[PDB]
Amino acid sequence: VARAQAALAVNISAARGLQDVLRTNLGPKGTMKMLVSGAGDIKLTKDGNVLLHEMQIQHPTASLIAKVATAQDDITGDGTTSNVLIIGELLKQADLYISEGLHPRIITEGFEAAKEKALQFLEEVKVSREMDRETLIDVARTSLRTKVHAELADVLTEAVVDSILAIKKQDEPIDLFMIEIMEMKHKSETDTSLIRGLVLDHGARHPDMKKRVEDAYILTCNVSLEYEKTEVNSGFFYKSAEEREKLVKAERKFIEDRVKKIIELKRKVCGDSDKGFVVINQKGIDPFSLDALSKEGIVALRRAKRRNMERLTLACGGVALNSFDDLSPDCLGHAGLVYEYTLGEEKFTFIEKCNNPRSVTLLIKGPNKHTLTQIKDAVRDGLRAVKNAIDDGCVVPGAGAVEVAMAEALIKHKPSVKGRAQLGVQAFADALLIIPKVLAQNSGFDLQETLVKIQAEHSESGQLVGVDLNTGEPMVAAEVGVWDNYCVKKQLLHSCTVIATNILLVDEIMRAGM
Amino acid sequence: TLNPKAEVARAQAALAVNISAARGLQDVLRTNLGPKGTMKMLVSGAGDIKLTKDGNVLLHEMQIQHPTASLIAKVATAQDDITGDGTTSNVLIIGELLKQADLYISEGLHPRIITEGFEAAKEKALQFLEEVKVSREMDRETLIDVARTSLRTKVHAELADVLTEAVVDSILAIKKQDEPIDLFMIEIMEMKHKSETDTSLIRGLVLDHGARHPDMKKRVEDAYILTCNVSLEYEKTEVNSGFFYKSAEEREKLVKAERKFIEDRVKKIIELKRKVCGDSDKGFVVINQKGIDPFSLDALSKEGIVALRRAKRRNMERLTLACGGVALNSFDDLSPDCLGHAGLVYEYTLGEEKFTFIEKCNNPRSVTLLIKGPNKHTLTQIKDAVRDGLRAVKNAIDDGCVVPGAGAVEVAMAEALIKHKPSVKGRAQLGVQAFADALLIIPKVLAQNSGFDLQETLVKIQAEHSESGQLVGVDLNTGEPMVAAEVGVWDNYCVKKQLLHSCTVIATNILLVDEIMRAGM
Amino acid sequence: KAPGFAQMLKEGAKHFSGLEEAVYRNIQACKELAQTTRTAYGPNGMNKMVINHLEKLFVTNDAATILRELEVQHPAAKMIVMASHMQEQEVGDGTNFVLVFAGALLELAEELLRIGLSVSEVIEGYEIACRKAHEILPNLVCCSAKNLRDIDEVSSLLRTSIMSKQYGNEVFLAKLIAQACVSIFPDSGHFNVDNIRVCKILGSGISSSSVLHGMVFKKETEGDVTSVKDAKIAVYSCPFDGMITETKGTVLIKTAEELMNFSKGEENLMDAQVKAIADTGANVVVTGGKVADMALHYANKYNIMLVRLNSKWDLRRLCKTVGATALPRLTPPVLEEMGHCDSVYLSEVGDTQVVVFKHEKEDGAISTIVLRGSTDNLMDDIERAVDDGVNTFKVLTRDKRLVPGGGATEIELAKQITSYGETCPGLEQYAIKKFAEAFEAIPRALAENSGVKANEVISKLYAVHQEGNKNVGLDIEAEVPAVKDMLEAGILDTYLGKYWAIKLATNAAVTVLRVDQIIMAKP
Numbered sequence A: 001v002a003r004a005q006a007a008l009a010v011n012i013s014a015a016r017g018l019q020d021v022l023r024t025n026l027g028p029k030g031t032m033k034m035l036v037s038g039a040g041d042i043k044l045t046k047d048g049n050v051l052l053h054e055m056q057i058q059h060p061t062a063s064l065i066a067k068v069a070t071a072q073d074d075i076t077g078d079g080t081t082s083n084v085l086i087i088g089e090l091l092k093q094a095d096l097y098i099s100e101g102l103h104p105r106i107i108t109e110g111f112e113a114a115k116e117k118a119l120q121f122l123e124e125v126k127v128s129r130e131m132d133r134e135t136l137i138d139v140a141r142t143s144l145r146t147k148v149h150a151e152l153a154d155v156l157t158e159a160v161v162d163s164i165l166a167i168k169k170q171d172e173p174i175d176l177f178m179i180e181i182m183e184m185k186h187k188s189e190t191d192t193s194l195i196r197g198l199v200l201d202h203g204a205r206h207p208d209m210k211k212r213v214e215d216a217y218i219l220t221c222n223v224s225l226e227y228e229k230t231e232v233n234s235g236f237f238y239k240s241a242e243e244r245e246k247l248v249k250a251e252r253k254f255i256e257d258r259v260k261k262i263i264e265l266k267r268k269v270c271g272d273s274d275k276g277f278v279v280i281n282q283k284g285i286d287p288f289s290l291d292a293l294s295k296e297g298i299v300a301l302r303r304a305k306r307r308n309m310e311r312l313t314l315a316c317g318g319v320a321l322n323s324f325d326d327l328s329p330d331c332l333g334h335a336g337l338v339y340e341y342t343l344g345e346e347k348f349t350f351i352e353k354c355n356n357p358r359s360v361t362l363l364i365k366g367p368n369k370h371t372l373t374q375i376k377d378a379v380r381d382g383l384r385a386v387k388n389a390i391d392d393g394c395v396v397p398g399a400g401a402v403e404v405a406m407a408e409a410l411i412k413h414k415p416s417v418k419g420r421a422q423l424g425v426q427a428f429a430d431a432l433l434i435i436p437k438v439l440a441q442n443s444g445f446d447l448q449e450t451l452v453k454i455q456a457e458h459s460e461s462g463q464l465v466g467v468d469l470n471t472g473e474p475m476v477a478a479e480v481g482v483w484d485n486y487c488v489k490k491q492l493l494h495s496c497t498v499i500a501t502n503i504l505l506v507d508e509i510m511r512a513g514m
Numbered sequence B: 001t002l003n004p005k006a007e008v009a010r011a012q013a014a015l016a017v018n019i020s021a022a023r024g025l026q027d028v029l030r031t032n033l034g035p036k037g038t039m040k041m042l043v044s045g046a047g048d049i050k051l052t053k054d055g056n057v058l059l060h061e062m063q064i065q066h067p068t069a070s071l072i073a074k075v076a077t078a079q080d081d082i083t084g085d086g087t088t089s090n091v092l093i094i095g096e097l098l099k100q101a102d103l104y105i106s107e108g109l110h111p112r113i114i115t116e117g118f119e120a121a122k123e124k125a126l127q128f129l130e131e132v133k134v135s136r137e138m139d140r141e142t143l144i145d146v147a148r149t150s151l152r153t154k155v156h157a158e159l160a161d162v163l164t165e166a167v168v169d170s171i172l173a174i175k176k177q178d179e180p181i182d183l184f185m186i187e188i189m190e191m192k193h194k195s196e197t198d199t200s201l202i203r204g205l206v207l208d209h210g211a212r213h214p215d216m217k218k219r220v221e222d223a224y225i226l227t228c229n230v231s232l233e234y235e236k237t238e239v240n241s242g243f244f245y246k247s248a249e250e251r252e253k254l255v256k257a258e259r260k261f262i263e264d265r266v267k268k269i270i271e272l273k274r275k276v277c278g279d280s281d282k283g284f285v286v287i288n289q290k291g292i293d294p295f296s297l298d299a300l301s302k303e304g305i306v307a308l309r310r311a312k313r314r315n316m317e318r319l320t321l322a323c324g325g326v327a328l329n330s331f332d333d334l335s336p337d338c339l340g341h342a343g344l345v346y347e348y349t350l351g352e353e354k355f356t357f358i359e360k361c362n363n364p365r366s367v368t369l370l371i372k373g374p375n376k377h378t379l380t381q382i383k384d385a386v387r388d389g390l391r392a393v394k395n396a397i398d399d400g401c402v403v404p405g406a407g408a409v410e411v412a413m414a415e416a417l418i419k420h421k422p423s424v425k426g427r428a429q430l431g432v433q434a435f436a437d438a439l440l441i442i443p444k445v446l447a448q449n450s451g452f453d454l455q456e457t458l459v460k461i462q463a464e465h466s467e468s469g470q471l472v473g474v475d476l477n478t479g480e481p482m483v484a485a486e487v488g489v490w491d492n493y494c495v496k497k498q499l500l501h502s503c504t505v506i507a508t509n510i511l512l513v514d515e516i517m518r519a520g521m
Numbered sequence C: 001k002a003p004g005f006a007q008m009l010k011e012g013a014k015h016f017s018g019l020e021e022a023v024y025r026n027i028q029a030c031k032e033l034a035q036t037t038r039t040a041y042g043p044n045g046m047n048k049m050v051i052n053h054l055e056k057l058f059v060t061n062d063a064a065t066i067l068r069e070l071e072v073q074h075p076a077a078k079m080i081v082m083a084s085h086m087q088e089q090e091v092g093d094g095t096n097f098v099l100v101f102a103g104a105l106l107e108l109a110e111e112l113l114r115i116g117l118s119v120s121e122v123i124e125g126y127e128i129a130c131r132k133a134h135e136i137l138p139n140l141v142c143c144s145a146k147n148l149r150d151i152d153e154v155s156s157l158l159r160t161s162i163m164s165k166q167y168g169n170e171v172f173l174a175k176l177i178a179q180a181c182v183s184i185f186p187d188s189g190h191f192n193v194d195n196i197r198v199c200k201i202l203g204s205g206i207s208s209s210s211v212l213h214g215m216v217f218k219k220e221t222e223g224d225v226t227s228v229k230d231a232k233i234a235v236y237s238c239p240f241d242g243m244i245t246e247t248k249g250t251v252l253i254k255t256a257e258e259l260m261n262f263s264k265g266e267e268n269l270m271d272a273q274v275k276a277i278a279d280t281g282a283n284v285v286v287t288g289g290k291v292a293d294m295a296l297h298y299a300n301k302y303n304i305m306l307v308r309l310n311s312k313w314d315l316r317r318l319c320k321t322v323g324a325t326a327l328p329r330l331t332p333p334v335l336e337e338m339g340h341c342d343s344v345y346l347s348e349v350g351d352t353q354v355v356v357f358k359h360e361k362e363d364g365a366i367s368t369i370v371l372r373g374s375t376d377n378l379m380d381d382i383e384r385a386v387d388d389g390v391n392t393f394k395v396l397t398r399d400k401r402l403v404p405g406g407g408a409t410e411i412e413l414a415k416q417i418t419s420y421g422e423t424c425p426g427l428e429q430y431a432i433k434k435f436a437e438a439f440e441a442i443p444r445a446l447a448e449n450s451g452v453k454a455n456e457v458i459s460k461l462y463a464v465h466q467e468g469n470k471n472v473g474l475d476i477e478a479e480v481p482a483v484k485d486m487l488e489a490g491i492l493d494t495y496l497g498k499y500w501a502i503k504l505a506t507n508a509a510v511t512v513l514r515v516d517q518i519i520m521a522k523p
């Protein structure tokens, strides 16, 4: 039943309902939410993407907004919970004029007029600063401080800035697959740093191994040195337990002939002093084969991954080998300090100081399980924000300085399609001011006190004004180092006009039957 | 924290009750604004049915159910006493003032900060009001357009032209040479058995009880007026005597002896008639309020004297001002110095009763407006329309400054309040912004009563901008932005002065309440 | 509690919201009032089973009797009833014309409000079409009266008023009223409805009725005086019996000797009261109560004509005819409360002695129509047909203009209004087009009561009016759905009766549509 405008009033209550939930986690002063899986998994996050995709809501209208933030991270990687706060106020301010008798198509025609004027205003406030070390700290500070309780906000900036700066050279496009993210327990949260080389999960397990190799030649191997099947036309036949002892020596002789071949290749190519040799074999290694290699000074590693083997190809330079019968020195690589890092329980092999690895591994350490997943979702949001700063050289001022400056530019603007589109630029100007409004509530200050001071600040010059998270005073974003991305704000105004249209463009809801 | 035999609202929901109560009263009175609005029905419970558009009758005599809406009904009692105009438009301001203020209370703003912006926006709108008003001299052309503004909202567009000339000539005859005007000088009379368009003006005064004799003159060209207050019937004794009789037949003779003190005074009326203007083409009219015996009426009617009886006290006060005759309380002191005079004294007959007229006087200082109608509810509605029409023209001559109607003031006041910097506080502009959209509800609801679009009318009157003085209003027939100062839509300055004062006081007191509790209820 | 009552804030009165359509409830209020009188229109209309408040049964089809007994309580429907009483003023026809046409006006106005038209714009289109309806109505006048003051002119034009009030008496009632109004028709401008008084005697039927001059009462003369030209008439509502004083007056009887003294004293006081009328010169006494047998002997002693009138309605008729005021005391000898009549005499009509009160030195305008009937229920229906027959011709003392009836002036008015509504630009063409379709419901009410399909009659009427064949109305036949000419059949109504009927029914649509909320108020 209810064939009337009641289908619009239920959809805006799901928008007002999703606005009042996600407004307490914007900025560093906001709170967090908990994600209980029902079985016992606890996760704390402030990211609005995981707060909409992983979090499940019962309302069907609010499930559409959960599909909005999934499309936000694919193009930009930032501004998903800020997408919800604008469209919550966009449909709230629309209800003040729909109840007066205005059609929602007219307000939609005014929203597209306000979108083209605000996108032209973004081209004038952007700053085409040269990308260096200092300006990428301020971009990383605006992104990483909203996922950190302010004890890792200073240490995690130099880990993500120096990682992306080591892979930005010769005008090459930034690839996030070059960055490897590893997690380890039994350490503090502030012990994270950057690693030049890779991190292998399983290392050498032998008492005669070298604890550190300063220079070595790395041979890429993929041959299973364990108990394998026959490569010659034979079979597995035995009459008793004594015949199995003869068969296991006739079967393993296909293995140790290859193990002694690696020693013959070690003595041939650089067999003198001041040398080294590391085996990076991905498959399993016989424990009896580990005694044969460790006596001559060969560190053998086993149980590797498929993606790690491709990174070992770029680090050392050795070609991936499939059979030991045609061993040749062009499959050899080179590396610097190859040593083992000792933990409380396990040990990890570190292969830093490479020639040209073109891959940087970020080492994130944490004492708890949910602490490791929080920083892992923080480093992926922080690295994508700096990647938006390098590829898009123009940046915008942060702390809501764009949204207050867009509110004045939309007031001094007349529509050119009709006279009834004047409410379209009116409601779009009021809904964009919710970001200085919600930053006052999360900081603990009054909402209307700092809104007056952020709007009264005008001068006869180019000056931007933002909100202060500590004192609530007018604060220039350029003077303190608070900056956002131009690509994120361009996708913010573009996605907010599309989604607030589709909620305004419905009039009836029906129960489908597939 | 509550006691029995009480009901206390402790949270902030007590503010949402009084806001939604005035928002409910706004939607009731918004359908009867302007001439395009509808009417309301008055059910007295016994069968008396009336249809009025006046906001005083819709709030003061009309009873309420919600207790919070009873306070707004007492506002129209105070609004009718000072200016007598603008009670429907006053509720629509408070109905949107508390609705617009509710948007900022949900954001956590204190009502003291919002009610301080209403005081800052009041003085800015009041200083803007002195530049909108026009101090032109009043005449027959302007006072018709003032009467055409107020009377057309209580008229179904058939009685608009015939009622405009009645309320203008009555006021212009009772006010000259800068004298203070009195609305009690105009007598309102009602008559049946005619159409509604037969409302005309009477120069003299309509009396209810007339003369009852077949020998009475139906029309007198000139007659001398004698004001008396003594009963010419059979009265009691005047000297120290009593009721002494031998039987029941002797009692009728002492009544005749008692009538000799009365019938001597009747012969003195004929004595004053013959000596003072007792020639041909002359007459005499007695306006004695008390009763006169028909035996004494027989001697007066044969001499051409039209004697009246059984009048009202309000009628006898206007008879002494029209003719100038001093009221005589003793016939022993009868002298022609207390004699008055009048013009055409005639008794026009109706279908049921007869009523006399004392019109065609030089300066009787009393003008009677005779209303005629077929029904009782139509007879009350035109009487309600005249008293609303007489007050709008009264304020135009005392206060010579008049403002353009049709929402032309509130649109120009909305431009001044928006373009205004905060001067008393930082957060006081949020009360100025809510007061700026509160004045815009008057051109907003005038488009709904006319049937046009609410937003197509508001935008087109707001886009009218020029480098000169321009006050544009709404058009109820075309929908285009129309200059109300050119077409003749004018309001009084005292209406808009009390509209800004009473709205910032009452909507303050509704916003400044905290808790609602029963004191003995 | 939450949520509160939306818009109902005044004494708990049921204020319907915008979705609840508060203006639509007044339309349903006048729809139910019009439906009780829609099937009662026309000569083929149905009777109404009237049960009065004094527990008296009535079978009648008058439009005024339905509104007086069915006590309406809705004040939105009371605007048409107050307009129907305005229809009773200045004309005596069109009471069903107000209830049907204004009821069809609001029923067609509900279709306009469903599109989204404002109530202030539709009401302006009705007053425009009302002024256009007042222009074609002089143009629709076909013929007029002859103004010759004869029986044949009056009886030929009275056949419209006898139609639908009392069917079957078209030849009898057209001649009975025609013999009464021609005695007042030389008195130009003095024809009044209260001059023709109706009396009813229980008799055989309609054909035994007759018309008499002057005031005629059915009660015979109690005295033996047959004819006297006395002017003094003293009416007494008290019964003629023993004298009871306004003082104490304790009459004590103990033995049988005091029984014969006070009974003779009451006969002597009864002789003194008749002698109290004989000295003042009054030989005409009308008794309101009973007359004793000894008082009849004192009537023939002083030769005083005594008549007894028990009914108070016939006693009030003499108070406004000769000026005699009924005195409650036992014959007070006063002269101011008496009457004036030139000659009063006793005569018989249909073997029934009646008393005639006529004037010979005065011109005379009093007429009495002696009605006869077997049943008192059907005799009262003919009595209301006299009042609606005389008031049909009371308006003809004005400008004599006649229009054809039976949907002849209804379809022709609906044709020319639609031509004015088609060429009129703006949004006001919708209200004028529905003003013309409200004129089609009255021939629809006339055809549906005759057992004929209404759409077949309307298309037959619009086919002859498109070719210019004017004055074509409904043929009264259930089996023949055709039409006939109205000038050849003899149905001609009044132009002034059709003028106030469209004016008052349009203003009834003005008054109801301006009301969109009902509020109870306490004094």
Ligand SMILES: Nc1ncnc2c1ncn2[C@@H]1O[C@H](COP(=O)(O)OP(=O)(O)OP(=O)(O)O)[C@@H](O)[C@H]1O
Residues within 6 Å of the ligand: A025, A026, A027, A028, A047, A048, A049, A077, A078, A079, A080, A081, A082, A083, A141, A142, A143, A145, A146, A397, A398, A399, A400, A401, A439, A467, A468, A469, A482, A484
């Ligand atoms: N130090 C700061 N002071 C004031 N405002 C800040 C500061 N840092 C960031 N902001 C503001 O916070 C906004 C981003 O908020 P937040 O990081 O909580 O959401 P988000 O992670 O960007 O959302 P999404 O995950 O949807 O991209 C930016 O627009 C910026 O203006």
Ligand SMILES: Nc1ncnc2c1ncn2[C@@H]1O[C@H](COP(=O)(O)OP(=O)(O)OP(=O)(O)O)[C@@H](O)[C@H]1O
Residues within 6 Å of the ligand: B032, B033, B034, B035, B037, B053, B054, B055, B056, B084, B085, B086, B087, B088, B089, B090, B148, B149, B150, B152, B153, B405, B406, B407, B408, B442, B474, B475, B476, B489
């Ligand atoms: N001819 C007109 N055209 C357009 N607008 C008008 C016209 N006449 C009056 N108005 C507007 O209508 C408003 C007043 O409406 P209305 O007469 O219904 O209430 P009111 O009777 O003045 O109020 P109250 O009942 O308190 O006296 C004025 O503010 C004026 O702007």
Ligand SMILES: Nc1ncnc2c1ncn2[C@@H]1O[C@H](COP(=O)(O)OP(=O)(O)OP(=O)(O)O)[C@@H](O)[C@H]1O
Residues within 6 Å of the ligand: C041, C042, C043, C062, C063, C064, C092, C093, C094, C095, C096, C097, C160, C161, C163, C164, C165, C388, C404, C405, C406, C407, C473, C474, C476, C491, C493
């Ligand atoms: N036999 C008929 N032939 C033609 N038209 C008729 C006939 N009977 C009724 N009408 C039509 O009916 C309408 C009047 O009918 P009707 O006599 O029912 O009203 P009414 O009863 O006189 O009104 P009221 O209730 O005031 O007495 C007229 O328009 C007339 O044309």
